[PDB]
Amino acid sequence: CQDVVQDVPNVDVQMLELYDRMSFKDIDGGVWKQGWNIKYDPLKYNAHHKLKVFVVPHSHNDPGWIQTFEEYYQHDTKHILSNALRHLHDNPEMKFIWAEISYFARFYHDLGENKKLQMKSIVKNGQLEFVTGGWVMPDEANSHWRNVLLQLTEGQTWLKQFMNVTPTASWAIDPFGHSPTMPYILQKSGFKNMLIQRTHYSVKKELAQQRQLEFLWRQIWDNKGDTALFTHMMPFYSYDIPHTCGPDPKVCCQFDFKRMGGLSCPWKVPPRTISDQNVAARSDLLVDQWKKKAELYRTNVLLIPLGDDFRFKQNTEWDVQRVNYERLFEHINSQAHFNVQAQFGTLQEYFDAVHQAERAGQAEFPTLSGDFFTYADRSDNYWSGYYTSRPYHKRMDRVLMHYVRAAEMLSAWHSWDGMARIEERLEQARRELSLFQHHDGITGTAKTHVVVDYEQRMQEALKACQMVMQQSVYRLLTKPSIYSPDFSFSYFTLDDSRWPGVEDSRTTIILGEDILPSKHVVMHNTLPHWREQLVDFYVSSPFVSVTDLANNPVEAQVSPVWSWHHTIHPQGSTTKYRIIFKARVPPMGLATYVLTISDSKPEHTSYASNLLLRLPLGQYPEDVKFGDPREISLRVGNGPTLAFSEQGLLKSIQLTQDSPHVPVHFKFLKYGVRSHGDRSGAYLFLPNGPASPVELGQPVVLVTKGKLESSVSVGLPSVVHQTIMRGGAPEIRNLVDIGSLDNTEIVMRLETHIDSGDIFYTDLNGLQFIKRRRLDKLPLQANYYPIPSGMFIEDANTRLTLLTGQPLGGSSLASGELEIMQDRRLASDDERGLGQGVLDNKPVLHIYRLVLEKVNNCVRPSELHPAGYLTSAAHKASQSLLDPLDKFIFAENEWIGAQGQFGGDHPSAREDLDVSVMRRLTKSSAKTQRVGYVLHRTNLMQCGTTQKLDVCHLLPNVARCERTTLTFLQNLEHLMVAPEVCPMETAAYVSSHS
Numbered sequence: 004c005q006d007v008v009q010d011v012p013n014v015d016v017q018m019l020e021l022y023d024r025m026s027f028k029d030i031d032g033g034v035w036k037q038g039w040n041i042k043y044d045p046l047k048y049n050a051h052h053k054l055k056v057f058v059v060p061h062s063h064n065d066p067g068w069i070q071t072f073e074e075y076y077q078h079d080t081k082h083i084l085s086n087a088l089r090h091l092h093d094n095p096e097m098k099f100i101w102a103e104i105s106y107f108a109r110f111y112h113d114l115g116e117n118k119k120l121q122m123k124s125i126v127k128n129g130q131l132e133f134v135t136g137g138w139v140m141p142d143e144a145n146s147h148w149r150n151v152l153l154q155l156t157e158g159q160t161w162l163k164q165f166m167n168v169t170p171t172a173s174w175a176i177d178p179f180g181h182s183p184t185m186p187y188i189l190q191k192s193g194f195k196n197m198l199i200q201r202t203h204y205s206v207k208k209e210l211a212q213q214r215q216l217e218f219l220w221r222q223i224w225d226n227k228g229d230t231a232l233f234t235h236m237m238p239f240y241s242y243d244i245p246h247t248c249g250p251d252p253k254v255c256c257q258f259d260f261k262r263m264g265g266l267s268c269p270w271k272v273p274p275r276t277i278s279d280q281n282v283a284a285r286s287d288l289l290v291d292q293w294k295k296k297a298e299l300y301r302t303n304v305l306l307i308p309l310g311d312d313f314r315f316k317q318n319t320e321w322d323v324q325r326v327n328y329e330r331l332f333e334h335i336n337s338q339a340h341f342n343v344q345a346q347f348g349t350l351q352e353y354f355d356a357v358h359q360a361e362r363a364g365q366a367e368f369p370t371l372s373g374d375f376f377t378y379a380d381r382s383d384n385y386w387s388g389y390y391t392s393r394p395y396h397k398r399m400d401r402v403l404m405h406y407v408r409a410a411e412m413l414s415a416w417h418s419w420d421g422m423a424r425i426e427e428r429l430e431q432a433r434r435e436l437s438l439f440q441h442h443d444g445i446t447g448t449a450k451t452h453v454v455v456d457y458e459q460r461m462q463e464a465l466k467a468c469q470m471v472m473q474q475s476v477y478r479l480l481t482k483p484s485i486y487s488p489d490f491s492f493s494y495f496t497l498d499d500s501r502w503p504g505v506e507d508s509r510t511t512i513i514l515g516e517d518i519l520p521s522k523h524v525v526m527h528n529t530l531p532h533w534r535e536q537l538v539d540f541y542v543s544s545p546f547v548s549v550t551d552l553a554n555n556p557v558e559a560q561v562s563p564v565w566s567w568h569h570t571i572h573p574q575g576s577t578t579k580y581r582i583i584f585k586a587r588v589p590p591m592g593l594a595t596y597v598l599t600i601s602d603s604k605p606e607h608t609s610y611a612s613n614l615l616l617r618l619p620l621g622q623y624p625e626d627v628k629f630g631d632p633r634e635i636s637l638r639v640g641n642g643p644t645l646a647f648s649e650q651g652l653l654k655s656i657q658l659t660q661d662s663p664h665v666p667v668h669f670k671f672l673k674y675g676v677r678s679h680g681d682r683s684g685a686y687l688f689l690p691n692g693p694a695s696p697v698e699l700g701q702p703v704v705l706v707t708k709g710k711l712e713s714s715v716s717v718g719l720p721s722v723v724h725q726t727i728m729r730g731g732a733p734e735i736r737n738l739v740d741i742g743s744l745d746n747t748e749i750v751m752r753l754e755t756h757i758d759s760g761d762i763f764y765t766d767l768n769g770l771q772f773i774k775r776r777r778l779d780k781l782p783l784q785a786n787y788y789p790i791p792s793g794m795f796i797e798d799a800n801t802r803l804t805l806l807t808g809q810p811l812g813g814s815s816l817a818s819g820e821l822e823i824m825q826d827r828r829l830a831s832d833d834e835r836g837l838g839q840g841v842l843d844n845k846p847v848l849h850i851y852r853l854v855l856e857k858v859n860n861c862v863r864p865s866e867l868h869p870a871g872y873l874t875s876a877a878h879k880a881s882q883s884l885l886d887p888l889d890k891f892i893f894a895e896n897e898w899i900g901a902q903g904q905f906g907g908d909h910p911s912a913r914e915d916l917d918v919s920v921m922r923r924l925t926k927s928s929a930k931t932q933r934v935g936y937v938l939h940r941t942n943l944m945q946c947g948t949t950q951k952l953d954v955c956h957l958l959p960n961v962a963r964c965e966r967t968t969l970t971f972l973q974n975l976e977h978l979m980v981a982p983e984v985c986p987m988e989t990a991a992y993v994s995s996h997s
């Protein structure tokens with residue numbers, strides 16, 4: 004295994020290093036607005052050194068944006084793929100690439116058998132080529148790496164199953180900036196090449212000047228270069244035809260033959276039909292554009308994309324584009340003075356030719372590490388808005404992520420009879436979650452009615468996972484001699500304290516000495532180690548005692564159920580109470596407990612005090628005390644001591660008894676919208692200067708203090724803010740309701756004396772932490788980065804890490820600060836084609852963990868390393884947000900067969916290892932059962948403080964085991980023990996069973 008801490012990779016282009024060197028001047032470059040006037044020596048080309056030109060037709064098909072998936076399918080995409088099948092069948096030289104497998108599966112299953120076989124023939128002979136072959140073209144900012152792999156797996160599994168092809172070239176022309184998570188996953192899924200488009204106009208210019216637009220993209224920690232993937236960055240403003248033929252859109256627009264009589268060229272020179280009278284002049288004009296594009300690249304092989312949004316819809320667009328281009332190719336190829344060979348081609352054809360040129364010593368490509376965030380398409384129009392837009396659905400993504408993992412893991416342990424409809428359910432759940440990874444899904448850049456479609460699809464997916472999970476738990480914990488399932492029955496309902504939070508959903512367990520004395524509850528632990536976590540349930544009485552199934556008592560706390568009402572004041576229930584206790588759950592296992600009512604206070608249940616600083620609670624045995632606003636200090640267990648202001652906001656953290664009171668102030672601020680010039684929208688973050696504090700007024704502060712759990716809650720305007728303490732890093736919950744505050748972005752900022760300087764760290768796709776440097780030379784919105792799972796600041800002694808349960812936008816705009824946007828309400832459109840602002844806000848419960856740590860005894864990476872690494876504590880805290888324990892309440896009065904535990908024999912793997920995916924790959928009807936596992940090992944900082952896990956042997960009667968691509972679709976290594984994986988490596992294994 005490489006050291007990913009002490010050794011700094013040597014690369015030609017390191018994006019943090021490049022960003023520091025670059026001036027980012029927005030100078031007018033001429034016809035190429037953001038570059039220069041390209042010049043080539045025409046004696047470069049001759050009969051032995053020709054320019055080889057691949058014109059690759061394509062159609063950008065969004066699975067939701069202005070219209071829903073189904074609306075676009077019926078209006079546009081079904082016509083595009085019908086015409087593709089017809090025109091490619093009829094015209095053997097015509098080529099076409101397709102990215103979005105969600106639309107292609109939708110289309111293909113509706114074809115007659117004859118059309119299906121015609122479709123198969125144009126894929127077999129390389130006319131129609133799948134590029135990436137993901138379910139969608141995913142967002143690369145907000146997306147979790149697990150969901151990127153999920154949607155890739157769903158598309159390529161469909162392609163291999165129904166078309167017997169697996170793409171090895173990726174096409175990502177529309178995501179709003181680009182993550183190195185994509186090559187990481189692609190290169191471990193058999194990919195050889197990838198293409199990207201939406202990078203900062205100054206980055207395009209800088210790299211274009213050095214012909215570094217093609218590069219071997221490696222991970223920021225990768226010293227060896229084993230992660231390296233060949234990347235082609237397109238050089239210009241757009242993927243449309245005006246911006247793909249060459250540097251002058253005025254000329255290129257004339258070679259988009261659909262723009263003749265209801266689309267036109269904004270540069271006012273129309274395309275003209277190619278005739279014997281003009282082909283000589285047109286060819287000269289076009290080949291001059293191509294030869295300028297070729298100056299930006301190191302080989303004599305040129306990629307010329309030919310397409311746009313929902314193109315190749317009408318049969319006559321196929322005609323007009325194919326016939327004009329063929330007349331040009333025929334003229335150009337026959338005329339030796341050009342020294343061009345031009346033809347229709349595919350993306351793979353381009354990359355194959357480029358690598359032939361490389362092997363022949365004709366070019367040697369530079370190495371690159373880093374990311375391509377934050378994207379600007381022009382001037383100061385940075386796309387940091389969508390890091391936060393529609394934060395409700397951003398949170399929902401992380402919840403559905405966890406439920407699909409839990410549902411697939413729990414149901415994997417057994418084969419299911421097809422009458423159970425497990426496969427049906429999991430396929431729906433995976434596809435709705437896969438669809439939401441679209442760059443108009445999780446981004447929050449779709450119209451209101453499309454966001455509603457995504458929400459309803461994810462809601463059906465959640466319900467599907469719940470049904471699989473409850474059926475699975477009943478089977479795993481009911482004695483096999485008794486187990487006799489009704490596959491339509493709800494044996495358990497799920498209890499979730501964190502989603503929606505917002506809604507009054509959660510069921511109250513009703514107990515009574517006569518009516519129903521006791522209730523079985525079950526906790527699931529998807530992580531492959533022993534875990535202890537406080538769980539809570541709503542109960543009808545405060546006189547409840549907790550036992551395991553062996554009747555061993557378990558220490559418990561009962562709190563009141565509080566709600567907030569609109570000044571903003573708390574109200575308490577007189578009919579339901581929270582019972583709180585510590586569940587100990589095996590690795591990838593289940594634990595059963597029992598809640599029992601009594602006359603009065605049981606031996607092993609404590610009651611929390613309540614202090615209203617500025618109310619009956621039924622049979623709650625401790626009355627609510629009252630008082631004037633004042634500072635408070637709270638400690639739970641031997642964990643930290645937290646001090647709060649008189650407004651209920653954290654002011655300091657003391658880690659241990661004999662350590663300092665470290666200042667850490669939470670503060671809410673607001674950003675506004677520019678009155679004159681560019682308006683913030685779903686995409687763009689264009690603040691009118693620094694954020695200004697939110698007037699907190701005189702807010703009610705609720706203090707609950709218990710043996711197991713305490714909290715400080717306050718009703719601020721727009722936000723119920725809560726700090727929860729359970730004996731380690733506290734948990735922050737914001738109930739965010741931006742209500743009517745038009746042209747407002749609400750931000751949450753932390754202020755420390757940490758000596759961070761201009762340095763902060765933010766994660767990419769919850770996989771890796773990347774070093775950011777604040778740049779005063781760039782506007783505020785450019786120092787905003789994705790916060791998909793966490794951010795931190797540190798000096799020589801102290802680190803502060805904020806972990807998120809949801810992707811949001813954030814920065815460190817000054818030494819010792821962190822900030823993260825909560826929500827944004829925007830009256831204006833930002834002129835990127837969405838044609839509306841963001842006025843559909845709804846209450847969302849944001850969740851966080853706050854880890855203050857001393858790092859002076861931690862082995863930090865080189866001051867030159869572009870990566871940072873979490874501590875054990877911060878990593879485990881991210882794990883508690885993203886993959887908490889699942890809670891099951893038994894639906895019926897009695898549970899015969901009930902067992903106490905599943906997975907007590909499962910190995911407890913080292914803390915840095917995760918079984919990201921467990922998925923049974925085969926239905927019951929298959930002779931050999933097969934189960935897929937994705938193993939991810941992170942890298943944790945060593946600070947001076949477990950069994951071997953072999954997934955091949957987790958299920959019994961293993962006949963075979965291999966290392967696979969992460970999609971499980973190809974074997975890389977026949978083994979039957981899975982070897983343990985390196986820090987920052989992800990490996991897949993498929994075990995076969997007799």
Ligand SMILES: OC[C@@H]1NCCC[C@H]1O
Pocket residue numbers: 065068177442443448835836
């Ligand atoms: O995916 C649809 C749109 N394409 C152009 C850039 C913005 C994006 O939402």
Ligand SMILES: [Zn+2]
Pocket residue numbers: 063064065177442
């Ligand atoms: Zn798009």
